[PDB]
mmCIF file of C-alpha atoms in Angstrom:
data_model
loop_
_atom_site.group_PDB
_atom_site.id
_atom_site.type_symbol
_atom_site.label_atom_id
_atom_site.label_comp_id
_atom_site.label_asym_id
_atom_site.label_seq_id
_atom_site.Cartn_x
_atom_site.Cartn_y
_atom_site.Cartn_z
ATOM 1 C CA UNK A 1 -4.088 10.264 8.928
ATOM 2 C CA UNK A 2 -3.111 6.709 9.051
ATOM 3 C CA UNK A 3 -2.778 4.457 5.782
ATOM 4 C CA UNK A 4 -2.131 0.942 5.340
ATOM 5 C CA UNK A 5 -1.118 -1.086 2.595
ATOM 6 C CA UNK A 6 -1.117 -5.328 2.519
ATOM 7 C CA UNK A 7 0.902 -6.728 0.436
ATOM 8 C CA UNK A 8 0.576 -10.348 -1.192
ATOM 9 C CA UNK A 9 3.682 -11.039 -3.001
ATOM 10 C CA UNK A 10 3.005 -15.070 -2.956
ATOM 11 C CA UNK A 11 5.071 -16.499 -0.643
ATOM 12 C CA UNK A 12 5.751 -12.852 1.035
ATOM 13 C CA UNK A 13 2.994 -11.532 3.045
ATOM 14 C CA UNK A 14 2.707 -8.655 5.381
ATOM 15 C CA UNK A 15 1.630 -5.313 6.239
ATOM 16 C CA UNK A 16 2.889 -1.443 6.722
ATOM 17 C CA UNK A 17 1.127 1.934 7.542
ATOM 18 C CA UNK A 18 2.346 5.273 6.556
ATOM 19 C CA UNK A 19 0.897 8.981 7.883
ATOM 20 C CA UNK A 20 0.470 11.169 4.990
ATOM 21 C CA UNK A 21 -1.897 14.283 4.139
ATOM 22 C CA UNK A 22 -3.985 12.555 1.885
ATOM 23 C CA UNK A 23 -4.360 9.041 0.511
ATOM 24 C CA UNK A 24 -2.232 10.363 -2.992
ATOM 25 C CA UNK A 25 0.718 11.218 -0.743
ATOM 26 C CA UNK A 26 0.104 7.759 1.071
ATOM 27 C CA UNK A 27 0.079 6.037 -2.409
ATOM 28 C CA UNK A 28 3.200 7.541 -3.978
ATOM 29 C CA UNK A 29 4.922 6.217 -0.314
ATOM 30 C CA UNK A 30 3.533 2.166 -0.742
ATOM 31 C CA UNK A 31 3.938 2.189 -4.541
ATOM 32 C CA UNK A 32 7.555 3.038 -3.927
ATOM 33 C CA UNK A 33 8.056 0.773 -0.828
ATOM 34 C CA UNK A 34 6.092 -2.388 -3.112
ATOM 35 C CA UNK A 35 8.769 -1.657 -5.844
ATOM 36 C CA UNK A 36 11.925 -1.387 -3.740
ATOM 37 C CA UNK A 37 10.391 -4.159 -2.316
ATOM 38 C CA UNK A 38 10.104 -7.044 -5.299
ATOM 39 C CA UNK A 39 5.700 -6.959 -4.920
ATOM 40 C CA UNK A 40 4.297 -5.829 -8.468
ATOM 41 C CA UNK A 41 0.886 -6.369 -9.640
ATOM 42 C CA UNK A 42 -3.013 -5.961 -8.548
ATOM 43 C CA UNK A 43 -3.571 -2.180 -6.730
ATOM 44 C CA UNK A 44 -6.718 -1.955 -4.580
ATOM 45 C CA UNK A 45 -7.740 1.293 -2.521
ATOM 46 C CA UNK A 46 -10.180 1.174 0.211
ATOM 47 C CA UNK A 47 -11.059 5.285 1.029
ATOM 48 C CA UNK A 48 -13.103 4.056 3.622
ATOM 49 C CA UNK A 49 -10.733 2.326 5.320
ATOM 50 C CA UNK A 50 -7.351 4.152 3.930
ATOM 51 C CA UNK A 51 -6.390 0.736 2.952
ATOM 52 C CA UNK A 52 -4.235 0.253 0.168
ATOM 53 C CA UNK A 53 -3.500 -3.334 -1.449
ATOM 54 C CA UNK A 54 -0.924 -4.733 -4.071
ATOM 55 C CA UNK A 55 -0.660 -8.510 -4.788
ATOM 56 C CA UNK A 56 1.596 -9.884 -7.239
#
């Protein structure tokens, strides 16, 4: 399935999906991605939605 994550790094904004088998898999993908990516802070997850979000 399709999961998204929205990130808020301040200034930064912006979004990415991912297709994983579950929403673990999904959230070991954006966890990595906000790292490599300088966003580190608040995690939300939306199962309803497969909507991940991390703001700084």
């Amino acid at each position: 399935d399709t999961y998204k994550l929205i990130l808020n790094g301040x200034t930064l904004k912006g979004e990415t999906t991912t297709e994983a088998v579950d929403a673990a898999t999904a959230e070991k993908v954006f966890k990595q991605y906000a790292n490599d990516n300088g966003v580190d802070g608040e995690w939300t997850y939306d199962d309803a939605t497969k909507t991940f979000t991390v703001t700084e």
